Amino acid sequence: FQGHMKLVVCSESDTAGQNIKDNLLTFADFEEKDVGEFKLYLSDEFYIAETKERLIYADHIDEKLAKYIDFEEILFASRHSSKDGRKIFTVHVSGNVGTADFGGKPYSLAKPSPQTMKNYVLALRERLDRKPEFEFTMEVTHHGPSEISKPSAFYEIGSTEEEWKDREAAEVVAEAMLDAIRAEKMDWNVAVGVGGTHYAPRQTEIMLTTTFTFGHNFAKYTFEHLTAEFLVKAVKLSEAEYIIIDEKSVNSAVKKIVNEAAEVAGVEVLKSKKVKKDFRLV
């Protein structure tokens, strides 16, 4: 059973997650309840769940929470840590290709939530100028938890403690989440992306300016470990009808498995430049 409400999940020890939570709590009349290992906040709008577990290791947490409440998807609210120290708002779906160094299992992918991710990004774009020093960017699929069956995605703030403690940054994310949760448009074109650096530049531009959204995205560092069958799993899991390639990143070797996957799954392959040109929004 999936119910019809959306669930925001955060970690008790995550500063960013907590600030996002505090802001989300003012958007509706909530009632806290402590069941099992969680702290649940209920309302007739959306749900919020607090766990003491580190999110990247929260495999099967959707099954655990589903014992107490019904929800159709999860929006993980968390901080983003990076050595670049850049101030950014990011979105990505968890999952691993060849290595599972930070949660989950190898070659396992979490169920994405392409529509909500898209609505969130457009709602964020609308407010980005409130925090001029911040920039938005997608993150390729990486890190745990990989064992999540309910549609999901991670909505984060980074890259250091300076940003995690940023009250307004968390408030902007919370507002974008509320807009995503209430959004009715659920027919954005869905694709799995292949190619690019860890911050998926092409995919980020596509998310901000076209009618396309993404489920999973695989960075160039994953090329050697990708297989045609793994890509088919990603496409079907994402409910994608397309595979978009970063034509400047993909090599002939990876293009072969991409084409293989496209044929087996019955989806169309499109170059990122063509997507940006023929699928603009306004």
CA dist., res. 49 & res. 238, Å (int): 24
CA atoms within 13 A on the CB side of 97: 21
* 165 and 59 together in one domain: yes
* 225 and 121 together in one domain: no
Q: Of 155, 186, 217, which one is at a domain's C-terminal end?
A: 186
Q: Which domain holds residue 75?
A: 1-186
CA dist., res. 20 & res. 167, Å (int): 8
Q: Of 186, 206, 222, which one is at a domain's C-terminal end?
A: 186
CA dist., res. 232 & res. 253, Å (int): 17
Task: State the resolution, in angstroms.
Answer: 1.8
* 48 and 147 together in one domain: yes
* 138 and 47 together in one domain: yes
Residues 95, 109: contact at Cβ < 8 Å?
yes
CA dist., res. 128 & res. 278, Å (int): 25
Q: Of 186, 207, 236, which one is at a domain's C-terminal end?
A: 186
* 205 and 168 together in one domain: no
* 2 and 138 together in one domain: yes
Structural tokens at position 94: 């968890």
In the chain, how many domains are there? 2
Q: Compute, in degrees rounded to 10, the torsion defined by CA atoms 129, 133, 138, 141.
A: -150
* 140 and 79 together in one domain: yes
Closest CA to 121 of 167, 72, 179, 171: 179
DSSP one-letter string for the chain: ---S-EEEEEETT-HHHHHHHHHHTTSS--EEEEETTEEEEE-SS-EEEEESS-GGG-TTHHHHHTTT---SEEEEEEEEE-TT---EEEEE--B-SS--TTSS-TT-BPPB-HHHHHHHHHHHHTTGGGSTT-EEEE--S-SS-----S-EEEEEEEESHHHHT-HHHHHHHHHHHHHHHH------EEEEEE-S-TT-HHHHHHHHHBSEEEEEEE-GGGGGG--HHHHHHHHHHHT-SEEEE-TTT--HHHHHHHHHHHHHHT-EEEEHHHHHHHSB--
Residues 237, 109: contact at Cβ < 8 Å?
yes
* 86 and 222 together in one domain: no
Q: Solved how?
A: X-ray
* 158 and 214 together in one domain: no
* 1 and 137 together in one domain: yes
Give CA 223 to chain center in angstroms. Answer: 21
